[PDB]
Amino acid sequence: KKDIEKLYEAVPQLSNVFKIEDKIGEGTFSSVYLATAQLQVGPEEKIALKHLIPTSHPIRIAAELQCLTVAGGQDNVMGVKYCFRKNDHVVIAMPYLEHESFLDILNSLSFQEVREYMLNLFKALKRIHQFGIVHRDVKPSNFLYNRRLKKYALVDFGLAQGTHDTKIELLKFVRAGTPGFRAPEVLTKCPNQTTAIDMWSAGVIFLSLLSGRYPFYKASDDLTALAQIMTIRGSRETIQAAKTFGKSILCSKEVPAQDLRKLCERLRWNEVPDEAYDLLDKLLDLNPASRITAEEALLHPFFKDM
Amino acid sequence: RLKKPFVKVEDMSQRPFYLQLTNMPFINYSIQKPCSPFDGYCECCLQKYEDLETHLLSEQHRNFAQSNQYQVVDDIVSKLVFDFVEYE
Ligand SMILES: O=c1[nH]c([C@@H]2CCCN2)nc2c1oc1ccc(Cl)cc12
Numbered sequence: 005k006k007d008i009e010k011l012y013e014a015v016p017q018l019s020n021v022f023k024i025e026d027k028i029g030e031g032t033f034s035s036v037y038l039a040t041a042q043l044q045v046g047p048e049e050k051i052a053l054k055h056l057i058p059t060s061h062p063i064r065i066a067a068e069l070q071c072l073t074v075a076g077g078q079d080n081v082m083g084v085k086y087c088f089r090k091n092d093h094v095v096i097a098m099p100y101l102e103h104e105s106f107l108d109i110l111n112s113l114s115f116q117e118v119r120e121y122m123l124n125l126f127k128a129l130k131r132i133h134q135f136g137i138v139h140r141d142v143k144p145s146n147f148l149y150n151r152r153l154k155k156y157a158l159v160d161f162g163l164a165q166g167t168h169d170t171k172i173e174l175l176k177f178v179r180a181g182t183p184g185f186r187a188p189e190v191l192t193k194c195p196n197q198t199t200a201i202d203m204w205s206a207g208v209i210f211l212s213l214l215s216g217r218y219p220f221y222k223a224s225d226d227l228t229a230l231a232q233i234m235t236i237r238g239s240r241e242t243i244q245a246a247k248t249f250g251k252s253i254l255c256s257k258e259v260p261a262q263d264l265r266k267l268c269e270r271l272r273w274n275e276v277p278d279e280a281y282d283l284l285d286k287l288l289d290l291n292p293a294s295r296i297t298a299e300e301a302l303l304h305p306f307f308k309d310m
Numbered sequence: 311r312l313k314k315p316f317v318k319v320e321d322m323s324q325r326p327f328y329l330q331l332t333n334m335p336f337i338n339y340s341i342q343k344p345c346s347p348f349d350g351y352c353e354c355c356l357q358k359y360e361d362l363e364t365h366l367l368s369e370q371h372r373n374f375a376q377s378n379q380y381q382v383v384d385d386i387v388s389k390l391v392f393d394f395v396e397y398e
């Protein structure tokens with residue numbers, strides 16, 4: 005309420021255009037608000053307004069906008085309608101999509117709905133990865149899901165980096181995500197981090213969906229998450245994989261790799277196919293070179309026929 | 311020499327970092343669904359701040375905030391189509 009007032013004051017032009025109703029999201033680097041506006045084309049429309057923290061470097065602001073303009077608005081990737089600026093305050097106006105809380109729907113989705121969710125996530129990931137965008141903060145709060153409408157939008161390019169050959173110019177001139185969704189090569193600070201790190205994240209999401217638990221890896225720092233990952237995927241397996249990316253991991257307590265089906269079943273629909281756990285295993289590959297890509301994921305037997 | 315349990319991470323070509331907890335993570339199946347089985351700095355002024363509001367109000371920030379450094383942002387904005395109705 006006081007936040008709404010301060011936003012209007014920071015970007016005065018907003019009061020000419022929007023009736024700002026409520027704050028619908030908040031992260032380290034932004035707050036997202038629900039607002040109403042009148043379209044010239046006729047309809048009134050619900051709008052999401054994303055106020056970026058005024059400490060963002062202009063290049064960071066610009067790179068996020070460029071992701072939205074170039075890659076967004078298609079294939080379950082959020083696009084941008086307009087952008088408002090007064091000085092250091094930038095507000096991105098995007099279409100509003102009404103959406104579920106992940107906690108709410110988690111234990112109430114049918115299995116077919118689990119597979120539709122994952123299929124549609126991989127469509128969004130394939131799209132951004134085609135442009136050489138590494139999202140770096142893929143998690144349920146950044147993947148909008150309208151259960152009723154079966155609509156999906158991947159959001160928030162505010163932590164993105166480019167691949168070596170990225171098609172988003174500003175990304176070459178480039179902030180840490182949630183520990184629980186970060187890949188082993190991320191947690192261990194590998195200098196080379198590719199699109200594979202987002203595929204790991206999608207596997208953590210899939211792990212929550214199959215086990216009925218969220219947040220799966222509940223960790224406030226990177227090494228705690230790594231320790232939790234080792235109890236799932238195995239310490240020896242993690243130590244071996246980390247070598248392939250130039251990291252030496254020592255662990256005092258050896259813990260075995262878990263069977264994924266048994267893990268998810270004990271944590272948690274009557275005949276989940278082997279293909280689901282096989283796909284999970286590929287998503288949670290400890291080696292980022294061998295980890296499945298979004299394009300490969302879409303062709304996985306788990307998704308015949310959709 | 312490190313008290314157990316620990317995790318240690320080093321780059322294979324050289325500064326180590328560590329984890330030490332009372333207990334290592336343990337997969338808890340008995341905890342009920344949906345609980346986990348395991349249950350600033352300014353980029354503009356290139357400086358860490360004490361308080362956000364007061365840092366924004368500082369002449370260092372105000373100066374950046376009002377410069378031409380957001381040209382790169384306005385350049386993309388100019389390419390977008392304004393399709394809302396605007397009131398006076
Ligand atoms: O970039 C976003 N981040 C977020 C969240 C909140 C701040 C951290 N990520 N939400 C949205 C974002 O864009 C949106 C567009 C429409 C709707 Cl309904 C929500 C969002």
Ligand SMILES: [Zn+2]
Pocket residue numbers: 059352353354355356365370371374
């Ligand atoms: Zn500053």
